[PDB]
Point group: C3
Chain length 221, copies 3
């Protein structure tokens, strides 16, 4: 029942992030700047849409495993499924311009979310965590590769990008670790937390990561 407040809050917040970014972003940009802007604006857009989809909750109300709906989750996975990739793309793009690197990273990302979804939807009783574990592995890979990202400085311009990246990586890591813990504990893991919590926590992370990173990139640009 409660979910609606959190989700509505999210819809508004994210939507706002989107709009705001369209305005702020636009400005003086053709290449790099516009690339960053577009990439980081699309995210919020998506997230907003999805949030409205989550709030309204279309489709049907069937249970995969529990006594909780399925539209919410599905939506989440769509959100993260496009978001993540794009976000990763942006950050990577700021530093590394290696085809192999990026491609690999986005593929790894792909299976992270995707497999997470697999696990989320698995009907069986105890093996959702098998998938979770694989998701964990993938996530770790993304992070390790981010370690490299930072590490390998190479082609760098102004100092600002370095700092932006520095804060960006911390936020990223944090938020992105939070994801799996919250997932495991609540939502589609064990069910340690009631229900509300899932939505609140997950939304907290969502908005913080997307709008936060958007703002850090706003700071950078």
């Amino acid at each position: 029942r409660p979910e609606w407040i959190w989700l509505a809050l999210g819809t508004a917040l994210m939507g706002l992030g989107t709009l705001y970014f369209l305005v702020k972003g636009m400005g003086v940009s053709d290449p790099d700047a516009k690339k960053f802007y577009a990439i980081t604006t699309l995210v919020p857009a998506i997230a907003f849409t999805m949030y409205l989809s989550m709030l309204l909750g279309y489709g049907l109300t069937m249970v995969p495993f529990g006594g909780e709906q399925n539209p919410i989750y599905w939506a989440r996975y769509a959100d993260w499924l496009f978001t993540t990739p794009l976000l990763l793309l942006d950050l990577a793009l700021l530093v590394d311009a290696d085809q192999g690197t990026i491609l690999a990273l986005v593929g790894a990302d792909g299976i992270m979310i995707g497999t997470g979804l697999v696990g989320a939807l698995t009907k069986v009783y105890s093996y959702r965590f098998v998938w979770w574990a694989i998701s964990t592995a993938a996530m770790l890979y993304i992070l390790y590769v981010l370690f490299f990202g930072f590490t390998s400085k190479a082609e760098s311009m102004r100092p600002e990008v370095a700092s932006t990246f520095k804060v960006l990586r911390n936020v990223t890591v944090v938020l992105w670790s939070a994801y799996p813990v919250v997932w495991l504990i609540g939502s589609e893991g064990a069910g340690i937390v009631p229900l509300n919590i899932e939505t609140l926590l997950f939304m907290v992370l969502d908005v913080s990561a997307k709008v936060g990173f958007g703002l850090i990139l706003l700071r950078s640009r």
Copy 2:
């Protein structure tokens, strides 16, 4: 019942467009020419497949909201979902070669179709138009960005490309405005038109946009 004539007509027409384009297209092309050819040939291909899928209508016969089937619609959304992107890609490619621009544009496109689909499938009674409205917004964005496309001449070769683009934008705009009106009025909107009409109108636009643009690009190349 009637739908089969329209859809069969479409299957044949589109298929023909595809084949024809394979022949016509092929020729002297490696880079640009081949890029244009491939990009504009794939569309028709897809549309044909989908049209056969629509005509045969696989899956199941369940109703989202009404007393009309669901294979047709779904198919349509797949069609537009790949088509649009590719078409937009081609046109953009002809003028603007800005990563940001293109990416943004295709993302916007993405949510246009996608969200359209969301709205199309929503089970609730009155909120399909909420999604429709968002779809409207997105569409508008695509168009506005096309205004820019034209506007920003910059790097240009022969005069022919300018003219081709000129006719292309008109056709595009027209057809693409028609989409939403027809959608709203018939199919999955209100249901002002019987049923037949949905198929006929939507097909008219389809074939005209894809084969027409293909032919305009045929003219250009």
Copy 3:
């Protein structure tokens, strides 16, 4: 019932291919080398995941047309659906660097698998082969274009790449012809083979194509 041995074998085998390739691959690579490595490592990854999904068989146990499950097949199509594209991408990348060429090829690929899936899921009795036929056409196109790939030597470095490609094309063709024959005869075609066979044969091809090509590329690099 039997399927589990084949699928478990596959999970292990493929997983091993993935891991092994992460180790072997990694090494000295930034550009080309890393591109090849990443591209060819992702495949196995995917295949593994999917194989675990196939072995465990989540979702539900409904029949499209027969008395055999649906998770297996679905999984297969996901596997091939990403795999193929990536594999094709890698091979193409080794020779041809033509946007048009590649894009076209991957689009053709796209409909190959995709349409194959369409056919696979069609509920009707006799028209699965219509789709199959279209899939056949597409496959053929991929192969013909590969004929060109070989044919058009152009920009070439060392001799090793030529040989690698030479073995790669043979393997590719072979395996890829095998697919459709096995499909038609067993699984979702007629049902000439019991059930086991489908899994065994299809897995044989899978592992051989992915790990084999991976190894040929390992040889090359």
